[PDB]
């Protein structure tokens, strides 16, 4: 930076402290990636100055011919990398992709049916303080008990009572794969919409590791910032017969001027992720994400559904009797950076919880392989085990910076 | 720009195109302005990868000491630019801001008066075709026939007959002074809370040059990116009374994670809006808007409610035979950006109108004076007294890239 230390040096002071933090820590938080210094320079653009309110080729500003060009990129690579036939990158977040979504299907009070916010849910996927659960009204299909995995006639007999006008599938925390083909079935037995939000997963999907929701859903929402590695922001995919009334629902509906800047950063995360090496880098976020289950069940722990078939997994600390609480506070102390988390069934409060929620696409991307994920579960181990002992944590705290150098 | 052209030819290309245009074209969308590089910089920060979600020192994902400072120096330096006593600065938009206000004191149906959409009221201030009139039953006041002005006394019959839960005071198109004290006595008389959407108006009202809603409304929205000359984005300011529900409207209500990059980029703006150079900067807005009214009435041209208390005018182009979309396009020509806009009583469709609508904040922004605005106006009389002359359009081409040198 050349200004903003000038300009500002209460922002710059405390930036700089953040930058500092992101190299220090092992950032484990399963939602969190790097982007890159392209996607960044693309943000700090003066497409900020644009007004540019509708589409492109159809805006309510003039000057708005290379701000199109733009954002004809994202929506053309975003259809090249997901095969929908429609694309809107003007969401400004996965909540508001979300609320578009819900804003074209339903009317006030519609019943929609989502994944239980206990069981691995979004809080836009009805939670009755978010929007979506004071406007609509949500019913919650759960897990297996026993194996955590989605019980897809606890989906279809929820569908049958509560009838509901739309079904969401997708999660914050479910580390197995999601049966989108299972959830049309549904959809299509009760004649109700299918959306997916498929934010955690997208870059997965993106390159190949999960299967592609875009055929199975009438809607499919993501965020960019996750394991698609992009810029802050979401984006909806849909059938071309919903073309028009999403893009309505977005534009004059929710929203009001796009965020060209970002729709920028976007193009050229798309562009990255249609690379054959954003696909090496998916399936290593995979990989890894398997070796740390099986190194930390080789330390002893217990996780949800057994393991994980994606980018993340969750611990259930109740065999080591600590809360997600107790957990995320000492792994804080010694520079590892988890999430509290509810495990399915959980006996504590979402405050509190038996769980922590762990991901590894952040540390994928800052070059970590199968012998970091083991020794990250080591890390774990020690601590998880020791948290009464200051020796125990200072150890951890110096393999921790070994690990980031 | 290092990485972005590297890595991205076809993006880094549209965007130096969008760059080469903004010095080109003189800008006269009211609602536009050019950021500083220290305002850039902070949105092409690290920032973007940190999730964030609830508030400084109350957030739900560890690690946020260094955004949490950097959120709290947008607070409360948009507290000392307006006096608040509470901000939140996460607001993704004015979209945004002004949904999480109706979300925190109107349920589903509630009547709420706002300024009537064809007089200068915004879309999200009841538009049948957004959120805001599909949610809430709007109802609209109205400006008088000969003055353009609010007319008070149809603001008070409105809300007297309708009885709304929340009063709208504000505009996209008025420019005029509003008279808040007027709008918070008719709230008290009716049992109404007051909202001000301050959006356009924002700069001006930090730099002294328009009376501050604040002390009258019980909430304050306003959007960062237009008078205020910030990064895209929204903003509420409440009293203390209101500051957890709003906070709370926000999140876990309407938005799911902060975009901390541009939180900082908030500050940013608001550190310079606090420099005395800024309250030079919005007088000459406001005497360059007067100015070039004058300078057009001096041409010939009749403008809504006479001339201009602030950054922005409406030219009523009836006596000229002439549609705000017509005037638009010939402009667009000669590389003079404007808006077509509906005038108070309109015969003309939204879609057509008999006005434009210009600001002078970019072009001041970039230091045009009195000179400059004489000339501009001598410009837009040259080309719409001459829309069938393709000798006079030139002319006015050569003169637009004389003043963009």
Do not use: W
């Not at 006030?108 to 609509?136: A, C, E, I, W």
Request: glycine share 8%.
């Amino acid at each position: 930076m050349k200004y903003l230390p000038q300009q500002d040096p209460q922002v710059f002071a405390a930036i700089e402290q953040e930058r500092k933090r992101q190299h220090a820590k092992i950032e484990l938080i399963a939602s969190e990636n790097f982007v890159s210094r392209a996607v960044m320079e693309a943000q700090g653009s003066v497409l900020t100055n644009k007004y540019a309110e509708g589409y492109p080729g159809r805006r309510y500003y003039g000057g708005c011919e290379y701000v199109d060009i733009v954002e004809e990129l994202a929506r053309e690579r975003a259809k090249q990398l997901f095969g929908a036939e429609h694309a809107n990158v003007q969401p400004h977040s996965g909540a508001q992709a979300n609320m578009a979504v819900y804003f074209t299907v339903l009317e006030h009070g519609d019943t929609v049916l989502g994944m239980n916010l206990s069981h691995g849910g979004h809080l836009t996927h009805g939670s009755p303080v978010n929007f979506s659960g004071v406007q609509y009204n949500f019913v919650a299909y759960g897990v297996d008990p026993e194996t955590h995995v989605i019980d897809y006639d606890d989906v279809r007999e929820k569908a049958r009572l509560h009838r509901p006008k739309l079904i969401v599938a997708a999660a914050s925390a479910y580390p197995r794969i999601i049966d989108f083909a299972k959830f049309r079935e549904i959809a299509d037995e009760v004649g109700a919409y299918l959306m997916v939000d498929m934010a955690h997963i997208a870059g997965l999907v993106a390159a190949g590791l999960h299967p592609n929701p875009v055929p199975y859903a009438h809607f499919v929402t993501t965020t960019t910032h996750k394991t698609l590695r992009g810029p802050r922001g979401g984006m909806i995919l849909c059938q071309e017969q919903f073309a028009k009334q999403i893009d309505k629902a977005i534009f004059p509906g929710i929203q009001g001027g796009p965020l060209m800047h970002v729709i920028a950063a976007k193009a050229v995360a798309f562009g990255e992720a249609l690379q054959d090496d954003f696909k090496a880098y998916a399936k290593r976020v995979v990989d890894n994400a398997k070796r740390l289950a099986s190194a930390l069940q080789n330390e002893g722990f217990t996780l949800v559904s057994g393991g994980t078939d994606n980018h993340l997994l969750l611990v259930d600390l109740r065999p080591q009797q600590l809360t997600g609480k107790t957990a995320e506070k000492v792994l804080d102390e010694v520079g590892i950076t988890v999430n509290k988390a509810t495990i399915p069934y959980d006996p504590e409060s979402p405050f509190v919880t038996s769980g922590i929620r762990i991901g590894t696409a952040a540390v994928t991307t800052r070059g970590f392989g199968l012998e970091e994920m083991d020794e990250i579960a080591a890390i774990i181990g020690l601590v998880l085990k020791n948290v009464g002992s200051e020796q125990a944590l200072e150890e951890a705290r110096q393999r921790v910076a070994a690990l980031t150098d």
